[PDB]
Structure 1
């Protein structure tokens, strides 16, 4: 890598790994469109397996960006419309609080207070119908944003219904394969287990547990190479050959709602560039990011703005990920770690690196 990239990445990440006691980490910097990779530490402490460019990490909520894009692709295919009521795709959702709640509200966490987590007790498909039927919104739809797995998770499940494909099959066929993300998975195959890093929570090696709508909200595992390709795809959607996927990417970066200086896309979150680093750094902290906040509708949504800082944080019990890019500068970064460490530390490091290179 050019020495400038080598230096800012190592001078920023090495201290981070030491301060946060991260076992293993992989970073990709996309500079002028080309990827540069960096790895440190361990994917499996006990077995002394190092992190490599082929190591799989749990992406946690960064998976929502894939769900948003898959949803965008379904819209582009004419299979669903964000203005469609949720009941159009789940007629069994007859409870009256659902009248007025559209796929847009589900995708953008504005349905009226759907909860952050789907309860552990929910497993069967009928357990899920019961959970949503019994949920009582705190607010009218389209008035407040409350980040929630049960919101975008349901959007993902419903978005693929017209296709008749399972969510995993749709994701593989319509997003992973076209983009050549050949080492990106919702369920890690046995052939790839040798590369699946363990996550570490309080020193214990752990992997994400099965849960309702897990694939849709936090279930993707990927390598640093495939994630750099994901960043390149989102930085330059026009280079993508598959028409509906190119449009879906563009739709996921449209600005649907505004809260403070942040705009909500489908999965992706965006701020105008140049950004005030404190605004995105402090903003990433969980109980700012997970708070109930009033939203202003952007009517109609603003098409993807090239001069934006587009990003998403993600975590599972044992992993912490972060992706951010700036279309206008053809610049981006992916940070994958097998410890769920504070979001502000991720954003601070990313900003230090990208600001140095911009």
Structure 2
């Protein structure tokens, strides 16, 4: 029945949005299911398979959040610290009045989704943070942002003395059991890297950008993402450092109505209505700043999700610890976040 449920709910989306290829993974009671559809490459007629590498987009934030949780539990950082304590060069500039938790969770009060296009170099990055100056009451307003978690990410790599790409590929990925997850796809794996397809069905991949690795720059396979979901459902089986990191990412920090923000993960009381899952990615929540309130109801039974996108790829990831289930969907064309969320909802709810 798992296979038949995904065929009912995910398969039609390939035709509906002319998506070349898709990989849907389900984990239940420590049993993994992998469903593959279509092509990693239209021009090569190479099929999507277990070796196919997709761009995760903002699901990369979950790895950046896990890397921070690890660094905090090795004593390398505190989430009450300010960025200037590690990147000396910002060390009494006004960015050093925002703390790492506030960076991680988007409540600087003045960071947008993107850098400005003009910024590209390492010096242009450091200079934009040297010249960063306040706006909304720090800590009070959530606005989703690549530079913010991007800065948290870089600060985490500074506290670990290793550039960010190495923190993941030598430290975090091996600790999670991930064999084919990369910030940079090496030469021997380029044959498995899918093409993404833009809205003109042109084959494309992700463009270089400032602090792209920590905010949207991880590439993985379906087996690997199911391993990552496994880890989130069962952190007690992993090494102490990574287990503590994973638990750290599950703690709700504030609410923005029915969405609780954690470290990368969005958190909900379970069971959640569909529409509660949809509003987490409504334009209001994703693009416009919003004022945060303190957690009032600590949810008893929780569920977590995150969407991601580069211009050629779509990702969605969801897990419910207490039902011991989760789902990952990866596509090499963006479909609307709404459609990702709904199909997953029907598949998981139908398997109890």
Stretches of structure 1 that go unaligned for 5 or more consecutive residues are none
Cα offsets for 1:122-141 (capped at 9, x unmatched): 22222112112333333011
With structure 2 as the length reference, what TM-score do the two structures score?
0.96
1-structure distance, mates of 2:165, 2:294: 31
- Deviation digits for residues 148-188 of structure 1 (CA, Å, limit 9, x no counterpart): 00000110000121221111111122211122211000000
Contact 2:83–2:91 (CA<8 Å) still a contact in 1? no
What corresponds to 1:48 in structure 2?
A: 45
Does residue 258 of the first structure (1) align with residue 255 of the second (2)?
yes
Distance 2:138 2:208 in 1: 30
Please say if 1:5 is aligned against 2:5: no
1:189-236 residue CA offsets vs partner (Å, 9 max, x unmatched)? 010011100000021100001111111000000000000000000111
Pairing partner for 1:335 from 302, 312, 329 = 329
Partner of 1:118: 115
CA offset at residue 87 of structure 1? Answer: 1.5
Per the alignment, residue 38 of structure 1 pairs with 35
Q: Is the 8 A contact 1:174 1:245 kept in 2?
A: no
Please list, as runs of the form range in 1=range in 2, the aligned pairs for 1:155-234 lying within 5 A after superposition.
155-201=152-198, 202-234=200-232
- Contact 1:306-1:326 at 8 Å conserved across structures: no
Q: Secondary structure at the match of 1:177?
A: helix
* Residues 285, 342 of structure 1: 8 Å contact kept: no
Q: Does 1:315 align with 2:309?
A: yes
Aligned to 2:61: 64
Shift of 1:109: 0.4
Count of residue correspondences: 351
Corresponding residue of 1:235 = 233
Tell me the CA shift for residue 94 of structure 1. Answer: 4.8
Q: Residue 269 of structure 2 contacts residue 300 of structure 2 at CA under 8 Å; is this kept in 1? A: no
Q: d(CA) in 1 for partners of 2:285 and 2:159?
A: 36
The residue correspondences of 1:104-143 to structure 2 (distance < 5 A) are 104-143=101-140
Give the unaligned 5+ runs of structure 2.
none
Write out the 4+ residue segments of structure 1 that deviate beyond 4 Å after TM superposition.
none
Q: Secondary structure at the match of 1:52?
A: coil
Preserved contact between residue 194 and residue 332 of structure 2 (Cα < 8 Å): yes
In structure 1, distance between residues paired with 2:6 and 2:185? 29
Tell me, yes or no, if structure 1 residue 347 matches structure 2 residue 341. Answer: yes
Pairing partner for 2:83 from 78, 81, 86: 86
CA distance in 1, matches of 2:140, 2:96: 15
Q: Where does residue 23 of structure 1 map in the other structure?
A: 20
Q: Are residues 1:146 and 2:143 paired?
A: yes
| CA-based RMSD | 1.7
Matches within 5 A, 1:264-283: 264-283=261-280
Give, in whole Å, the separation in 2 of the partners of 1:17 and 1:117. 29
Deviation at 1:306, TM superposition (A): 7.2
Preserved contact between residue 114 and residue 137 of structure 1 (Cα < 8 Å): no
Q: Distance in 1 between matches of 2:32 and 2:232?
A: 14
Please, which moves more after superposition, 166-175 or 243-252?
166-175
Cα distance between partner residues in 1 of 2:4 and 2:37: 15
Q: Secondary structure at the match of 2:253?
A: strand
Structure 2 contact 95–132 (Cα < 8 Å) conserved? no
Counterparts in 2 of 1:110 and 1:95: CA distance versus 1, 3 Å: same
Q: 1:80 to 1:259 in 2, by over 3 A?
A: same
Closer/same/farther in 2, CA of residues 326 and 173 from structure 1, 3 Å limit: same
In the alignment, structure 1 residue 246 sits paired with structure 2 residue 243: yes
- Displacement of 1:292 after TM fit? 1.2
Please state how far the C-alpha of 1:31 moved relative to its aligned partner.
1.2
